[model samples]
Target chain A: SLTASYETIKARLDGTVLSATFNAPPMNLIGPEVVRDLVALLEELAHPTAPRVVIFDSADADFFFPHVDMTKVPEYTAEAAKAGGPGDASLGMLFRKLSQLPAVTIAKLRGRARGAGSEFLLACDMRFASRENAILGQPEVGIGAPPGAGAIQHLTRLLGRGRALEAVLTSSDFDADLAERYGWVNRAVPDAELDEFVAGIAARMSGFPRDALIAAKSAINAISLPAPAEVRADAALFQQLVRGEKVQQRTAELFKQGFQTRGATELDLGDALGHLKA
Target chain B: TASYETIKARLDGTVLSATFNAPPMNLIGPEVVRDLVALLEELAHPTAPRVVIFDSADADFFFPHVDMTKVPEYTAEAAKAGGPGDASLGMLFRKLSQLPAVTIAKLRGRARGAGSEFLLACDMRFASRENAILGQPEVGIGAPPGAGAIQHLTRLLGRGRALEAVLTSSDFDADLAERYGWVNRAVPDAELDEFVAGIAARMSGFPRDALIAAKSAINAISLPAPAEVRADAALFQQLVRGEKVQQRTAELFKQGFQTRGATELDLGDALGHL
Candidate 1:
C-alpha cells in the first residue's frame, strides 16, 4: 500500500494545535491529493475557532517529502490554471497563504525537503530540524526549474543574498546544522529530541493568548515577509520555465534514475542531479 | 579628505570611508550629528562613492557615548532634522540604512547606546574579535534604546534572545556577538583591516545599479518599518531626559564614563549596579 496513494497526508486537530503528518507510502511526493488536503487545511485554518498553532511533520523518518511528483506536472499545471485565476490561485498560492496565516506555523523536519518540499518548509514561520537526519536543497535549477512559489524572497530574507544565491546555484545538500547557521531553520536538534523540542514550543505557544501570538507574529512578519506581488511573480516565472525541452530532458533523466522511488537517487537527489549527464 | 567637526570623509577609489576621528573615545554629540547630517547630504549625488564604510580612528572607542553637556541641544537638532516621510539619529541612521550605496560597520571598539544603534543602521557589520564590544545597556540606565536596536535586533536574534540583550543590558564581545547574529562576522583583530578593506573594494567594484537593486530588495524584507524605527526613537526621547536617567548618567561619568578605563570598559556592569 506504500505505492499508489489517495490522501497523501493526514492533518489532525488537537487542543489548540493543528498537526499535519505527510503519509504517502514509499515516499511522500506532493501531488494533487496532497494539494487538495493542504488547500482544505488552509481553509479550515482561516476559521475563527481554529487552533492557535499548526505544526507539520511527516510519517516517514527518512523522507519528510521527496518532492512534487515530476510525472504529474501536466495534471498539476492544469489544475493550477483553474484555481485562483490571475491571483495567487496557482500552486504557489497555497504556500503563500500558509506563510501569511495568523496562527503560528512551524515545520518539524526530519529527512529530505527539496524543491517544493523545501518551499513547503519555507512557508512556515519557524522550522526546527534534525541535525543528523534532515537535509534541504533548492535543486530546481539542476532540473532547469526556477524555484517557484516564495523560495527566492524567503531565502533572501533568511540567508541574505550572497548565501541565498549559493543555495540556489549550487544545488548541493544542506545539513540541518548548516541550515541553522544560515538561519534557514530556526534550530537543529538531535533526532532523538526533535519531537519533544518542537512539542514544548508548540504547547507553550498554544496555551498563550492567541491574539498576542498573532500580533507578535504579524509585527515580525511586517519586517520579515516578502510582498505578495514578489511571490506571485516568481511563481509565474517558474511556470514559464517548465515548457523548455532542456528541462524536459533533465527531468526525464531523473525519472530514469528513479527520481521518486525510495532508493539511492531519492536519498541523495542533490548529488544525483549534480552528476547527471546531458 | 573632507573633515567635518567630528567625522572625517575620505574617498579612495569608489570606496568612501567615514572615519570617526573625535578624540577621547569618540563621544557622539551635537557636533557629530551635524557632521553626519551633512555627510548624508554630501552622499546624495549619483556619482558619489558606491560604498561607505564607518570605522574609527580610536582603537578602543567607536563612538562610545554622547556628549553629556549638549544632551538637550543634540535631541532638539535630531528631532528637528527628523522624518524623511523621520532625531537626527532616528532619521539619521534610518537614512543611513537605506542609502543607495552599500554601508558597512568596521567595528573595532566599544559601541554602546547610540553607538550600537548607529552600527545597527548600517547594512552590514564586521567586527574585530579582540577589540569590538557592543550592547544596548539602555534599561540599566533607566531608558529604552532610543534608536532602532529593538526592532533591528529582533530581525537578527529573534524575540527571546533580543529581549535578553535588551532587558539584561549586558555587554557582548565579538565572538559571542557573532555567535548571536549581532555582527555579520567576527574577524580576528589582526585580519580585520584587510578583511574590511577587501569586502569594501569588491562591493564598490560591482555595477552600481545591481548593488542598489540587491540592497534595496534585501532591505525591504530585512529592516524594520520606518514608522517602527521612528516609534522607538519617540520612546527613547520621552524617557531619556528623566531625572533618573540624568542622575544615572551623571553617576556613570563620575566613574570615568567617557574616558578610557575600567568603568568605561565595564560600562554595562556599572550601569547595572548603579
Candidate 2:
C-alpha cells in the first residue's frame, strides 16, 4: 500500500495489525483536518492486503478526544460531505465507513471520549477502555443540540433506551467501569493492563484467516449497524439544533471558558457543560 | 387466585409479581407457554398493573431449556395453530415485550436456551450476581436457538461480543452478563430482590400513560423488527427437526439432559460432552 503521511494522525503497521494514533494537538480536538486525515487513513487501511486488524488510539494521555471542534463544524461538515456519497454526508458517514471496513476495528480508549469522540468509538467493532482514566459520554444535549454524528442511534443500540437517555439527558461523565457496565465499551481494563490487553486481542484476531475475519465481521455489521439514512438523520438533527439560540450560547460559552485547551473545561467537559454561562 | 398451573402471581397495588413454579426445573414447554399466553390476555386489559415482574420459584433452575422431549410436539403445534410467528414462543414473548406495563425479570439460578429467550423479551432484566447463569447453549447441542436471541443479543452486546456469546455456546455469569448488557444489572444476590423492587416501585408510582408512552417509543426504535422475530422462530422450527439435532439431543438426555439433576445444572458444559 502506497500510503502518504497524515497531518493530524500517526499510523504504523506491525504484522497485520495497524495502530492509528490521534495526534491533533490542544486536547486532540477533532476538526476538518482530523476528519480528512481519517478518511485518508481509512482508505489506506482498506487496501485488500493492508491489515487485518486496526487499533485507533490517541497520542495525548489526558484527552483521547474531548469532542469535535464545534468551531469547525462548517469546514468539518463540508469536508465530511465530500468524503463520501450523498446518502450519508455527515461526520457519521465517516464513522460508518470505519465500521464497514473489512478489517476488524477496535478503539483503545483512555482519557475522555465525549460527544463526537464517543461516536467514533461506537463505530468500531469493539472498544476497550482504561478503567482508571477512560471517561465517556454524549454531552451534545447539554450544548443545546442532539448528538449529530450518530451517537443518538449508536447509544440507543449500545446502551439501550433507559441508560442511553440517562447518559444524554444528564450529560454526566461515566468512568470506565460504569461505561463497561452500560455496554458503552466492550471491557474496562486496568490502565496498566490496557495496552497489553488490546494488543493480545488484536494479535489473535489478525492471525486468523483474512477470509474468515471478513465473513464474520460482515455478518456482525449487517445486524448491528444503523442504515445510512438513520445516521444521516442523526447528523442532520445535530446540524439543525446547533443553529438554535441556546446551542449557540452554550457553544460560545464553552469556547469562552477554555474549550479546546488542556484545562478544567476540556478535561471535565460533562460537568463543565452545565456550568457554562448559557 | 390464579388459574394458571405453572405460574403463581401476586398483585400489590400497581405492581404484579409473577413466579414460574414448574417444580423440579421450570422447563418451559407447552404447559408453561399455554399458561403465559392466557395470562397475557388479562394483562392486555385496561386495568393491568403498571409494573409486572417475573421470577422463578425453582431456586436452582429458571426454565433450563424447553423440554427436549416435547420440542417436536411444540413445533408441530406452533405451526398448526395459526403459525410460528403468531401462536408460539415468539408471539408469547412478543406480547410480553409490548405490554402496556413495564416488564422486569428478577433472574436467579440458570436461564438457558428458550429461558434466555424469554428473559430477552422482557423490557428490563436484573440478575442475581451470585446465582444467575445465562447462555444460549443451543449450538453446542446441535441447534440454533429458534427465538430472537440472534437479533436481541446483537442489539445489546454488539456484533463481536454477541457472536462470542451465541456462537461459543458458553455460559455467562451475572457479572459477565451485566458487562455484556445481557441483563440491565447484576446486583448482589442478597439485595437482588430489594434492588428490583425499588425499580418496580419507582416505575409503578409514575403515571401509567407515561410509562406506556416511553416504552412504546423505545420499542419502535430499539426492539427488533416483528418480521425478524417471526423469521427467527421460523428458522428454529426448521432446524430443530434435523436428524443431527435429534441424535445429539437424545445423547444429551442419556447424560441427563432435562433430568433436573447434575447435567442440567451445568448445561453449558454438559452439551460439550456430546
Candidate 3:
C-alpha cells in the first residue's frame, strides 16, 4: 500500500507514484531537515516495491529551492569536487541517489532554482519548467565558490565546451529558454499548465513497462558513464583542492556579503587566491 | 638552401600568399614553422595579410611529407633551436590559431599525419578531389599524433566521430573529407589549380586587415587566448619529450621513415628527445 506524510515538507504517494512537494517556511529554501526527509523518502522508494516514478516540485510558486544556507554547513563547497562519492549536503546525496535510482526521476521547476537548488533539478533525468517565472543558474562562481556538485562536468557534457565555460566563468542567471536550448531542461510549459504537464508526463512513465523501461534507460546511460575508478579519483582530487584554505576563506567572505548583494561580475578564482588570507 | 624569404610574401588587399619553393614534397619542418612565424610577425607590423595561402611546387605531393629531421635533437634544444625561441610545431599551432590571418590551406595531393596537422592549422582548407588523401595515421603505427592534432580534431568533429578516425588510423579521400567538414571544398582534380588560385585571389582582394580581425574575433569566442595557448604549447612540448614519444619515433624510423629519409614520425618522436 502506498503512503504519504508531511513534516517540514509535504509528501503524498498515490498508488505506485510518489510526489514530494517542498514547502519550507518563507522561501522554501532547502535546509538539513528537508534534505534528510527527502533522502529518507528516497530510501523508502528504493525497495523491491519502490515507486515507478518519483517527482519533486515546490509548494511556493516563486521559489523552488532558494540557494542553500551556506553559513550552516560550509563543507558543501569542498565536497563538490571529490568526483563520484555521495555529496556533502543532504541535497547532494539525495540528487546522486535520485539520478542512479531504478525509478524514473523528474524535477518540476516553477520558480527560482539557484545554486544547490538549481543543481538538484539539473541532476534529474528530466527537468520540466514553467515558462514565465523560473530562473536557473550556477551562481556560485560569481561569489567566489565553485559549484560543489557534479554541475561542472554535467553542464560541460550537456552544453558545448564554449557555452559551459561562459556559464561558469560568467555565473549569471539564465532563463528557462536558455536552459531548454542547452538541453538542460526537457520541457518548459506555460505557468498555468506547469502542474498538469509534469503530472501527465510522470504518470505516463510510471504506468509503462517498469522493468523494460528501467533496463532501456540503464543501457543508454552505460554509453556515457565514465568508469567508477576515474570518477572516484576525480572526486578525491577535487576534495583536496576545495578543502584547502584558499577556497575556504573566499567562500566565507562571499557568504558574509550574500550572493545577491555582490551584483554580477567576473571573479577569477585564481586571482582571488593571492588576495585570500591563507 | 631554400631561403626563408623565398617562402614569404606581403599581403595585398585580401591575400597574403606563401609559396613552398622547397623542392620535392614541400615538407614543412622547423624552418617552415619559423618562416611562417616570421612572415606572420612581419605582416603584423603595420597592415598584415588578411588571408594566408600555403601553396606548394609539387602539386602531387603538396605538403605530402613532414620532415622530422630538422627538429632539434633534444626537446628543449629543439624548441630553443627554432627561430621563435619556443618554435615547436605545437607553438606554430597556437600561433596560427591566434594570428589575424584567415589561413587557407590549398592541397593538391596527399597530406598525412603532421601534414594533416598543418592542414588543420588553417581556418579552412580546399583540395583536389583526385589523388589527395588526408589522415592522422600515427595512432595506427603505435604513435600519438602530436602538436595538438587530437585537440583540434576533437573540436572540429565531435568527440565520438573523431574517435572513429583516430582509433582506426585510416585516410579519407578529398570527397570524404569535404563531406566530413574536414576540408571546405574538394574540386575535380583537373580544376584543382584554378579552384585554389581563384579562391586565394578572391580572398586576397578582400579588406585584408578587417578580414584578419574578423577571423580573430570569431576564434576568440572558442579558441584559447595567447597565454593559455602558450601553456598548451608547453604541455605539448613536454609530451614530445616523454619516453613514449621517443619509442614511437624509433618505430617510425623502422618503417623506412618516408621518402626523403626524414620521417615525420622520427622527427616528431625525436622532438621530445630534443
Candidate 4:
C-alpha cells in the first residue's frame, strides 16, 4: 500500500501498526496543515485493511504539538468554512473520528502537549508519557476562552469535577507523573523507556483478534465516550472564543513574547503563560 | 436519640458518628437496613449534624456482606416499601449521596458486596492501609449488586477498573483501592480515626451553606442520575432470585457463609475455590 505524503506528518506501517509522527518544526504548533493531514490519516484508517494498532508520536524533541497556530487563525477559519462550517471541519471532528476508529490507538508523549495538543491525546484509547520530559496542560482559559475542544468533557470524566476545574482554571503545566496520578495518562515511563513501552503495548494489542478487540472497545466507548455531536459543538464554541477580543489580545501578547518562534516562551509555554499578566 | 440494634449513633458537637456494632461478622440484614433508614431519615432533617463518620465497632469486620438466608424476606420487605421507581435501597444511596451534610466512610476492615456499595455512596472514603479490604463479589455468587455499585464504580474507577472489580470479584486492599480512586486515601490503621476526625471537625467548622454549595456543584456534574441507579437496582432484584444465584448461594451456605468463618473472612478467595 502506498503511504500518502504529508508535509507536517510522517507515516509508515509496521505489521499491524500504523505509526504516525508529527513533524511540524519550530515548535510543532498544530494548525490547518496538521489537522488536514490528521483527517487524511484517519480516513485511511477507516479502511477495512487498515492496521489494527495506531501509534501517534512526534518528531520534535522539545515540543509535541504545543497548541494551535494563532498567526494562521484566519487561514484556519477560512479552511474550516470550506467544509460547510467550523464544526464540520474543526480539529475536534478529527479527534472524534480518531476515537471512533475500529483500531486501538495510543499516544506516546515526550515533550509538551498543551491546549489542542492535550485534547488530541485525550482522543486516543491510551496515553503514555515520559516522566522526565513530558508536560501536559490546557492554557485556553488564561486566554479568555475555556478549553473549546473536548478537554472539558474528557477531563471531567478522567479527573473528577474539582480536579478538572482546577486543571482548566489554573492553566498550569502538569508534569507526566502528576498527569498519570490524575488519570490523564495511562502511565508514565522514563524518557529512555517510553518508546519500547509504547511499542510493546501496541504490538500486544495488534496480536489480539481484531473483531473481539473492536467489540470490546465499542462496549467501553458506549459507556465512557461523549458523542460526536458533543465534540463538534465544543469545537464550534472553541472557534468562536478564539476570535473574541480577550482571546485575541492575550494571543497577541503571547506572540509578542515569542510564542511561535523557537524561544523561551515556546520552549516552556506553560510556565511562560503562567507568568503573563492578566 | 442514639440507641440502635445493629449500629450505634452518637453526636459529638456537629458530627454524628455511626458505628457498625453487629458482632462476629457484622452481616447486614433487614434489621440493619431498617436502622440505617431510620438514621438517614433523621439525618435528612434540617437540624441534623453537618458531618457523619461511619466506622466499625468490630476491629476486623466492617460489614462483610449481606445475610444470604434473609435475602428473600429482605427483598419482599423492600418490594412492599417501594416499586421500581420508588426509593428502595438504590434510592437510599442516591439520597445519601445528595444529602446537604458531608458523609465520610472511615473503613477499617473488610467491606464487600453491599457493604462496599454503602461506602461508595458516601461523599468520601478513607480506609486503614493495614486492614481495609474493599471489593464487589456479587458476580462470583451469580448475582449482580442491586445497589448503586455498578453506576457509581463506573464513574469513580473509570471503565476498566469497574469492569475488573465486577467481573473478577477479587479483593482490593486499601492502598490498591486508593490508587484506583475507589477510596479517597489510605491511612495507617492507628491514625485512621484521628485522620478522619480531624477532617470531619474541620469540615464541621465551615458554614453549612458553603459546604452545600460546593457539594451541589460537584454532584451536578459527577453523580449518576437517579433513574439509572434505579434501573441497576431492578436488574439486581431480578438476578438475585435466579436459579444460578440460588445454586451459588446454596454452595456458599455450605461453606459457612454469613458466619464468622474462614469462608466469610476471605470471601474473595473462598468464592473462587467454591
Candidate 4 off by > 4 Å: A77-87, A207-209, B1-154, B158-221, B226-274
Please give, for residues A13-90, the per-residue lDDT of candidate 4 as tens digits: 888888889998767888777776776777777787789998999999788888888778766545444433445676
Tens digit of lDDT per residue, candidate 2, span B1-274? 3657899999998788999998668888777877787677778788788778899989798889787777656544444333434755665676777888777888999999989988988878889989999999888877667776887788778789998999889999999998887888889999999978876654443433434533554566777777877888777778777998888888888887778777889888877777
lDDT tens string, model 4, B108-158? Answer: 889998899888888778899999999888989886777878887887787
Name the lDDT of candidate 2: 0.79
Model 1 residue runs over 4 Å out of place are A2-83, A89-121, A124-178, A186-230, A233-278, B1-5, B10-13, B76-85, B197-207
The model with the greatest DockQ is: 2
* Number of the top-ranking candidate, with lDDT as the measure: 2
For candidate 1, report its TM-score: 0.63
Candidate 3: DockQ? 0.04
Q: Best TM-score goes to which candidate?
A: 1
lDDT: worst 10-residue window of model 4 chain A: A77-86
Q: What is the C-alpha RMSD of each candidate to the true structure, in Å?
A: 8.3, 8.5, 13.6, 8.7
DockQ preference between candidates 3 and 4, better one: 4
Give per-model TM-scores.
0.63, 0.58, 0.51, 0.57
Which candidate model has the greater TM-score, 1 or 3?
Answer: 1
The superposed Cα distance between candidate 4 and the true structure at residue B221, in angstroms, equals 5.3
Can you tell me the CAPRI class of model 1?
Answer: incorrect
lDDT of 2 by residue, A187-213 (tens): 999989999999999989977999999
Tens digit of lDDT per residue, candidate 3, span B114-202?
A: 67877777766777887767777656545556655676667655677688767666777888776665675687978876766554543
